[PDB]
Amino acid sequence: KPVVGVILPFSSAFEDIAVEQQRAVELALAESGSAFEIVFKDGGADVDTAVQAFQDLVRSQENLAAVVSCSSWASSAIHPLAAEKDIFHVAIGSAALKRTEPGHTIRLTVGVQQEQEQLAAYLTDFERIAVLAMDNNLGSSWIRMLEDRFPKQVVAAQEYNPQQMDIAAQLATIKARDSEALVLISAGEAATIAKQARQAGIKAQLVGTRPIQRAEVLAASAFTNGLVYTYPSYNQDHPFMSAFTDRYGLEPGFFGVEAYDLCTTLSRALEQGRQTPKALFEWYAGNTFTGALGKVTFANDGDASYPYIFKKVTESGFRVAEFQFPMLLTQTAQELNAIFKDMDRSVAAAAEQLSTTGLRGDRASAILETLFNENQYAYNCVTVDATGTIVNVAPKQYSSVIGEDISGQEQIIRLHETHQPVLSQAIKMVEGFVGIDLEHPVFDQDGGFIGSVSVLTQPDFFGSIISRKVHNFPVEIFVLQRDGTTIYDVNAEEIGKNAFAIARKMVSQAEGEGTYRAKQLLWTSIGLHGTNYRLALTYG
Ligand SMILES: CC(C)CC(=O)C(=O)O
Ligand SMILES: Nc1ccnc(=O)[nH]1
Numbered sequence: 001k002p003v004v005g006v007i008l009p010f011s012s013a014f015e016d017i018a019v020e021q022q023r024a025v026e027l028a029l030a031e032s033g034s035a036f037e038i039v040f041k042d043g044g045a046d047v048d049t050a051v052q053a054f055q056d057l058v059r060s061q062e063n064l065a066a067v068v069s070c071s072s073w074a075s076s077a078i079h080p081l082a083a084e085k086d087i088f089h090v091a092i093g094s095a096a097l098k099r100t101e102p103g104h105t106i107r108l109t110v111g112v113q114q115e116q117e118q119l120a121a122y123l124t125d126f127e128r129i130a131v132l133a134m135d136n137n138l139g140s141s142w143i144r145m146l147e148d149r150f151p152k153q154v155v156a157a158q159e160y161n162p163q164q165m166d167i168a169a170q171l172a173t174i175k176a177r178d179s180e181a182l183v184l185i186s187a188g189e190a191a192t193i194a195k196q197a198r199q200a201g202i203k204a205q206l207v208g209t210r211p212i213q214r215a216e217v218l219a220a221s222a223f224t225n226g227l228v229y230t231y232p233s234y235n236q237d238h239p240f241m242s243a244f245t246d247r248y249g250l251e252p253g254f255f256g257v258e259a260y261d262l263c264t265t266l267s268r269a270l271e272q273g274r275q276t277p278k279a280l281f282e283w284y285a286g287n288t289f290t291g292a293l294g295k296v297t298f299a300n301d302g303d304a305s306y307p308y309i310f311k312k313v314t315e316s317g318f319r320v321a322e323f324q325f326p327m328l329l330t331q332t333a334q335e336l337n338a339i340f341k342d343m344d345r346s347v348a349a350a351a352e353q354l355s356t357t358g359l360r361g362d363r364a365s366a367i368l369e370t371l372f373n374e375n376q377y378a379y380n381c382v383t384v385d386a387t388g389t390i391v392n393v394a395p396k397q398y399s400s401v402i403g404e405d406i407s408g409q410e411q412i413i414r415l416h417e418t419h420q421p422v423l424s425q426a427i428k429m430v431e432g433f434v435g436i437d438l439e440h441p442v443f444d445q446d447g448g449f450i451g452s453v454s455v456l457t458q459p460d461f462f463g464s465i466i467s468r469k470v471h472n473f474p475v476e477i478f479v480l481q482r483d484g485t486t487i488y489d490v491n492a493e494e495i496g497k498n499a500f501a502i503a504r505k506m507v508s509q510a511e512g513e514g515t516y517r518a519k520q521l522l523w524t525s526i527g528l529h530g531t532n533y534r535l536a537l538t539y540g
């Protein structure tokens with residue numbers, strides 16, 4: 001009967017997390033039929049005490065199938081040791097895991113980097129940012145990340161021992177920098193940090209991360225109310241939530257939920273005969289599991305991934321932050337408008353220049369070559385004469401489009417009939433894909449119309465912008481044409497589909513919201529020169 005060793009920080013500031021994890025593990029094992037035996041060890045408060053628990057655990061257990069460790073510091077220290085002794089290793093409650101041995105250590109905790117990328121969407125609207133972080137590799141990793149992302153805005157980076165909780169100094173340093181947001185890299189001890197900071201006159205918006213969602217923090221809503229934090233987006237509907245609550249008298253937080261999915265999946269692995277470190281690692285690596293944490297996907301390097309959301313502390317409980325959905329849509333609308341504005345300016349400037357050079361030849365080509373470098377979302381740039389014929393292009397590798405008659409393209413007609421700039425609908429281009437063309441008219445020295453200059457955007461223009469914005473949030477953003485045609489959707493099978501073949505309202509209104517089936521929908525519009533696209537965000 002295989003033995004799994006489980007090292008948790010019982011003798012430490014994170015006692016409560018440790019007991020939660022222990023509870024969840026024991027609950028999980030009782031029901032699964034006990035595919036393995038558990039022995040618990042006390043990792044203590046620092047790295048040495050955890051390395052000692054591991055070494056002791058190895059000395060005392062011959063049939064040791066695996067070692068599970070809680071905390072970024074325990075896990076980073078055990079990782080190379082387990083590898084050397086060829087013991088399968090799982091890290092839980094470990095966002096700042098440092099990997100050196102490829103193919104070793106499976107990790108169920110989403111990393112600092114991913115969580116930091118999401119938190120940055122909120123923090124970017126604060127010009128003065130203070131950080132107070134636990135003095136261990138989780139704190140220091142968050143500090144180093146936040147400092148890299150926000151060089152100018154980060155005005156203070158203070159550490160604290162979570163066992164000692166002597167923070168009067170750090171909080172003095174901090175108040176003296178008049179921060180706009182105070183980021184706490186803290187678990188439950190944040191309720192005390194919050195109290196003292198408010199009593200010390202600090203009025204800054206409090207901000208935290210995954211570990212901060214503890215009952216202590218909610219109880220202290222007198223001080224913590226309004227605090228915004230990033231958190232895994234699993235729902236409460238899983239049977240584990242209720243089983244744990246009924247047995248132990250309180251709801252399990254992240255660490256319980258995580259520890260329950262570890263037992264469930266490891267149990268199944270040890271039943272199926274997987275027993276070597278390589279087999280146990282491969283069990284997880286590349287795989288998707290659905291469980292109490294929701295849908296969990298493991299990369300080839302053994303790291304779990306699952307979506308996060310913004311949450312906030314309120315008087316009545318921990319809540320999903322309503323603000324994030326319109327925020328993400330607006331932030332995306334804004335990046336798109338600024339990209340379009342940049343393109344429009346560059347093309348307008350290029351038209352001014354082509355006035356003296358004409359549209360053909362080496363001087364024209366040079367304007368085109370530069371215009372393309374000025375437009376990172378360009379596929380190419382052309383000039384088009386008064387007849388609607390492409391007469392020049394950069395990059396020159398697309399020289400075959402020269403001579404192509406595009407006088408029948410809808411935007412080209414409009415430019416010819418208005419002698420004003422146009423942004424096309426998403427139409428099939430001679431280059432071989434459905435794209436979007438921005439054109440400005442060109443006039444010679446005497447004011448006579450001589451044609452137009454164009455930037456054609458990349459085939460994946462919208463996707464390349466949108467997918468970065470929505471990365472790891474449980475939402476989708478799509479783009480619709482005025483006539484209802486889908487221009488961009490993360491599911492490409494939908495691209496090109498109409499909605500005349502809430503959709504009706506999206507056609508006629510530039511902004512809106514709605515609900516279908518249960519999903520919420522928000523939309524706005526982006527565009528130029530009378531060509532507007534609808535930008536919609538959906539979420540549960
Ligand atoms: C005991 C926890 C605060 C540790 C944790 O959540 C982490 O290291 O990522
Ligand atoms: N580069 C292009 C501009 C306008 N229309 C096209 O089909 N291609």
Ligand SMILES: [Ca+2]
Nearest residue numbers: 282283285286
């Ligand atoms: Ca696998």
